[PDB]
Design a protein around this ligand. Structure first.
Ligand SMILES: [Cl-]
Ligand SMILES: [Cl-]
Ligand SMILES: [Cl-]
Ligand SMILES: [Mg+2]
Ligand SMILES: [Mg+2]
Ligand SMILES: [Mg+2]
Ligand SMILES: [Mg+2]
Ligand SMILES: [Mg+2]
Ligand SMILES: [Mg+2]
Ligand SMILES: [Mg+2]
Ligand SMILES: [Mg+2]
Ligand SMILES: [Mg+2]
Ligand SMILES: [Mg+2]
Ligand SMILES: [Mg+2]
Ligand SMILES: [Mg+2]
Ligand SMILES: [Mg+2]
Ligand code: NA
Ligand code: NA
Ligand code: NA
Ligand code: NA
Ligand code: NA
Ligand code: NA
Ligand code: NA
Ligand code: NA
Ligand code: NA
Ligand code: NA
Ligand code: NA
Ligand code: NA
Ligand code: NA
Ligand code: NA
Ligand code: NA
Ligand code: NA
Ligand code: NA
Ligand code: NA
Ligand code: NA
Ligand code: NA
Lengths: 119, 145, 115, 246
RNA sequence: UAUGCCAGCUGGUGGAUUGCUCGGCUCAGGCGCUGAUGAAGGACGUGCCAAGCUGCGAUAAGCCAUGGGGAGCCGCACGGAGGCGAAGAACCAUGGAUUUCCGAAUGAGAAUCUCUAACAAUUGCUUCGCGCAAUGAGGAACCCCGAGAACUGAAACAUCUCAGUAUCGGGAGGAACAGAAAACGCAAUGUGAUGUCGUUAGUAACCGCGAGUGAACGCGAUACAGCCCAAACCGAAGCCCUCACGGGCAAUGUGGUGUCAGGGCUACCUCUCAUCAGCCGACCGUCUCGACGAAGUCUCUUGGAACAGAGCGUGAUACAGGGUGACAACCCCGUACUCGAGACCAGUACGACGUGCGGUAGUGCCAGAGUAGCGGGGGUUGGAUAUCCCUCGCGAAUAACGCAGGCAUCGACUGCGAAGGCUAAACACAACCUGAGACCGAUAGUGAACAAGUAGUGUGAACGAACGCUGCAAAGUACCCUCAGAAGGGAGGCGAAAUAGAGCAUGAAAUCAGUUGGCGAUCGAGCGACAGGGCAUACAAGGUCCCUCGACGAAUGAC
RNA sequence: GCAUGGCAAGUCUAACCGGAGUAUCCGGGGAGGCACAGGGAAACCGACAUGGCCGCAGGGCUUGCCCGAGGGCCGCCGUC
């Protein structure tokens, strides 16, 4: 499908497991070197650095990852509500870079390390 | 710019009164209607004439004029030369789906020619002999009597 | 409204010559050439053989086709020639582009117009 | 004429005779006609629904209610062309023939002529191509066909001082208009045509605006994209010899 | 100067315009049946809270297995509460479980419920018992067999035409149908099953000989494929059901042989590589799906945001397309390359097992009847005498015979065996999958981008809309004053922007409020064109114009 | 009909086939069509590559006089 309508359609309608790819980000130099991948599906454990938004430059821990909306929550990247409350400002993993990994999962780390699969 | 292109604005599009380009009445009838009444003009007259013979009782002859043969004798280098001698059958195209080959005598014959075909016309003969040549009637040509 | 850029130049050149040089044939041809393709000449050898004469360049303001026989040793000048024509012609004479004629004879002298 | 062959380093390596075809008079008018035909021939048939706007029993009340004689239903006008939701008077039709016929002779003549235009440094410079060379078309050793890396064709192109033309086509144009919505958002200048002999250069193809072709089937389009003659071409020692018989 | 006219300014109304695209439209490749094992469809249920939609079915947005997938998840749907997931959930693929009621609907009745074991009805086999089975209904069109108009054309109209069209009845399949000559008849020393495609040809033929209608042989292609009975001669050597026993069928003939390279019989020659039956069983290709997948997120400037400008650098068998706060090969998805899986091709091709092909001589043993053929009446066709068919009546030969070759009869010549049967592939459609576009871009394109066959209308058959757009992010407006007030208003907050504040991008015209300029309560109506005056006017995008005098000075031309 | 363009006594391929960059495109394919002869219901027969005269353009000459395609007027030829 070279057609814009179908392209957008397939992204917006991809089943749950096919959304993981929409929450991927580039990996710092060290990390690409260490595992042999250019980017990784951000996990709520990883640390990351904002490279584009108004929060570009800031670094923080990934607090949440939504697959439906293809967005993430990074600690301290927030907005001032009217009532004074502070809420997270959603980000696109495309403007983010993972500087640290949470590898408490054998499986993820298993995937990361192997050279025939990517995490 | 085309004629059609310029019609926007003319209203009528070159039909005169807007009361014109309606139905077939503006044509005097649908199809060839009136070919015998109002528009009999320029319509071949009515009736039947003659007859036809069954398609498969009809013989179609493949014809050629001396002039054609003669104008290219030299060029037909791939054809006998003698005291030229050409079998027409090999010359004429369509000489397969034809019931036979016939030489016609139109034009001139500037060479001495030996012609072999299934049938010739007086003129073709006279002309071909008149140039010190001969006409040879094929075995199929053996149908003269 | 001629489409051919070549036929278009030839005509231009034919004009340039007719004016400068004293020619009248060139301007004449220029005009025929500007006329509708259908009006241009299509002449077979059979005709050229019939009305041409040695040392008098035949000018065909059209194309020459190879039907018939040409024996005379004449110089024919046309817009173009069927391969057959230019072949039969060079066998007893010489086939020449009008562009070349304009150059070897800008006064358009001793020329015969055939159509 | 003479043709300067080049080795994969960009250094002269003998020379061959530029086949006759490259001497055919340039007829951009016939070329254009053949490119036009090619482009129409790949256009797809389309047409609105035969029944679009006719799906209803609407009827006209005629005279009597101070209303115009227009077919209506549930008090809403329908079917007629001047009525919203009505049929399209004269719509696009599947049935229409959108193809173009072109005499083989007329077409083949256009190919040779496009070929010829390739050998004119002036035409190629006018068509728009960027390069600092004097001879054209660029002819190269058959070893070109073994290249595998794009990057290598680049050095070879920079060595032949022809790489500036890819620099030219290394810019995209986001068109004006709705083509966008139909997957035609972009468009880019046509650069160099590489014509090999056994197969189309897999090493060159991805080059910015480059098109690859084979000597036996290269056409009037690759030879003169858009009907414009004079494309900066680079043949292969063998290609150049095959082309000659086209 | 009230009422008011013309133009504009600010705000509104309205939703055009431009941009955008989750939908349409069209083309193409692939694929293609479901159902008594109860389908399609409908009804009613099913969620913590649940109205609509979607799923599902009392195990009810689900249960189980295997693989994949992965750190998240609890449908569309972003609330509140609560829960599930490393015991590997979500999600995806395959397979399995459950699967109410009505429905072909089948125990009987019934507007989805009820009454007291059920294949109801019609059939086949039959242990003659519903014991074993079949049918029935659906499906986008496509296919086959039957029934069959009229408007219309003929410038009226009857034959003719529209047209075997619309529409109706019966039904098949993934394709149908056709099909191995009682053919063709470029008449031949020739061709060799059938569809379909191109051509033959708008030819031959028909026709108030008007209007119109309209093939075939052949030829070039696609794909290819050729067989089985009946009988003669044999005469139970046979078949079905059952694990078996046993039962059933069959002399009104199961079975062998045989099928125009005619066959059988008798005597011979030679041989099998035909055919038929059963076994094995793909490659490749094509469609779809999946794995992996190179290279910048560096500097300065603008900006809310760099995907912009300038500079520096990189990949490319990958510069298709998309996403991402603006124009991105190198930020992410993907794309090229390579690889894997499923489906179709196909239970086909190939291979193998069994069978045995063929030839000579003799033999009038066999070879499909209301048929071939004729006649009466219709229909249909290009079919004219010479299309194909129906109906009523009549009616033959037996291969030593019979039919055909575009009128009949007789003879000759040439072709060919009807009145039994089957048959792969090439062709149609587009439900389903995928892909494509000089198509439309929300009054368009489907009726339907939205709750769409929805709301709504009609007793019913049926009819049938309108409605897309906040923002980068909800940051979806805290607190205070006012108010009957979760209304509204004021002040205030967010944001680049609230004149982006909820049907929220832009925001036209008609038109409305307020207001500015001009006119105005003694005056006349196509509302203006061209001249010439008043009053009015920030810049910008136009910079000319006024008076004395003088130069030039056509026609005309004085006191 | 016409303007333009290709080829020319010829011209064009159709379905279809192979190739490929796979609807484009390159090659092949001339079945067949129209043109190359007509006349006649049919049987059947079967024509001027030019014999004469005017003469436009154009050319030539010693400057009206020649040669004069095309064009025009006749002859002659095929067939009913
Ligand atoms: Cl006849
Ligand atoms: Cl001629
Ligand atoms: Cl035949
Ligand atoms: Mg890995
Ligand atoms: Mg032929
Ligand atoms: Mg519409
Ligand atoms: Mg526009
Ligand atoms: Mg019941
Ligand atoms: Mg009528
Ligand atoms: Mg009449
Ligand atoms: Mg009819
Ligand atoms: Mg026939
Ligand atoms: Mg048997
Ligand atoms: Mg009829
Ligand atoms: Mg609509
Ligand atoms: Mg708005
Ligand atoms: Na007119
Ligand atoms: Na009119
Ligand atoms: Na008429
Ligand atoms: Na409707
Ligand atoms: Na009205
Ligand atoms: Na079409
Ligand atoms: Na299917
Ligand atoms: Na609900
Ligand atoms: Na189920
Ligand atoms: Na049953
Ligand atoms: Na029973
Ligand atoms: Na009428
Ligand atoms: Na009437
Ligand atoms: Na009639
Ligand atoms: Na033939
Ligand atoms: Na991004
Ligand atoms: Na009868
Ligand atoms: Na026959
Ligand atoms: Na709308
Ligand atoms: Na032919």
């Amino acid at each position: 499908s070279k057609q814009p309508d179908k392209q957008r359609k397939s992204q917006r309608r991809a089943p749950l497991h096919e959304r993981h790819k929409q929450v991927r980000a580039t990996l710092s130099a060290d990390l690409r070197e260490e595992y042999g991948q250019r980017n990784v599906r951000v996990n709520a454990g990883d640390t990351v650095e904002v490279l584009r938004g108004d929060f570009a430059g800031e670094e923080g821990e990934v607090i949440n990852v939504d697959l439906d909306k293809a967005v993430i929550h990074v600690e301290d990247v927030t907005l001032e509500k009217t009532d004074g409350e502070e809420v997270p400002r959603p980000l696109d993993t495309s403007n983010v870079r993972v500087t640290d990994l949470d590898l408490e999962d054998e499986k993820r780390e298993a995937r990361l390390e192997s050279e025939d699969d990517s995490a | 710019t085309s004629k059609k292109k310029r019609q926007r604005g003319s209203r009528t599009h070159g039909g005169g009164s807007h009361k014109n380009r309606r139905g077939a009445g503006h044509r005097g009838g649908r199809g060839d209607a009136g070919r015998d009444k109002h528009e009999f003009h320029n319509h071949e007259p009515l009736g039947k004439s003659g007859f036809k013979r069954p398609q498969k009782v009809q013989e179609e002859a493949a014809t050629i004029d001396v002039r054609e043969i003669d104008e290219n004798v030299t060029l037909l280098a791939a054809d006998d030369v003698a005291e030229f001698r050409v079998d027409v059958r090999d010359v004429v195209e369509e000489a397969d789906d034809a019931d036979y080959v016939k030489v016609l005598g139109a034009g001139q014959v500037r060479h001495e020619l030996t012609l072999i075909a299934d049938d010739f016309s007086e003129g073709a003969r006279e002309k071909v002999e008149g140039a010190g040549g001969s006409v040879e009637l094929t075995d199929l040509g053996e149908e003269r009597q | 409204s001629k489409t051919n850029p070549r036929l278009s130049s030839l005509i231009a050149d034919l004009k340039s010559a007719a004016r400068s040089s004293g020619g009248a044939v060139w301007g004449d041809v220029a005009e025929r050439l500007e006329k509708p393709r259908r009006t241009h000449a299509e002449v077979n050898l059979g005709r050229i053989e019939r009305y041409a004469q040695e040392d008098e360049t035949v000018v065909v303001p059209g194309k020459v086709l190879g039907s018939g026989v040409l024996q005379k040793d004449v110089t024919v000048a046309a817009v173009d020639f069927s391969g057959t024509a230019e072949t039969k012609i060079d066998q007893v004479g010489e086939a020449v582009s009008l562009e070349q004629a304009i150059e070897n004879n800008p006064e358009g002298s001793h020329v015969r117009v055939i159509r | 004429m003479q043709a300067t062959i080049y080795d994969l380093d960009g250094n002269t390596d003998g020379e061959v005779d530029l086949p006759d075809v490259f001497e055919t008079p340039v007829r951009s008018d016939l070329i254009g006609k053949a490119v036009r035909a090619a482009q129409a021939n790949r256009k797809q048939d389309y047409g609105s629904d035969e029944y679009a706007g006719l799906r209803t029993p609407a009827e006209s009340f005629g005279s009597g209610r101070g209303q115009a004689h227009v077919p209506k239903l549930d008090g809403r006008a329908r079917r007629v062309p001047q009525a919203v939701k009505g049929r399209s008077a004269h719509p696009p039709k599947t049935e229409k023939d959108r193809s173009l016929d072109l005499n083989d002779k007329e077409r083949q003549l256009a190919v040779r002529s496009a070929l010829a235009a390739t050998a004119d440094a002036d035409l190629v410079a006018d068509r728009g191509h960027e390069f600092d060379r004097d001879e054209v078309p660029v002819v190269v050793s058959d070893d070109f066909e073994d290249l595998v890396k794009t990057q290598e064709v680049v050095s070879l192109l920079e060595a032949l001082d022809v790489h500036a033309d890819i620099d030219r086509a290394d810019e995209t144009k986001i068109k004006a208009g709705q083509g966008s919505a139909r997957g035609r958002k972009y468009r880019r200048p046509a650069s160099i045509l590489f014509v090999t002999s056994d197969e189309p250069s897999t090493a060159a193809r991805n080059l910015a605006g480059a098109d690859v072709a084979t000597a036996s089937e290269v056409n009037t389009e690759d030879l003169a994209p858009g009907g414009a003659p004079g494309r900066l071409t680079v043949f292969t020692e063998s290609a150049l010899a095959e082309v000659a018989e086209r």
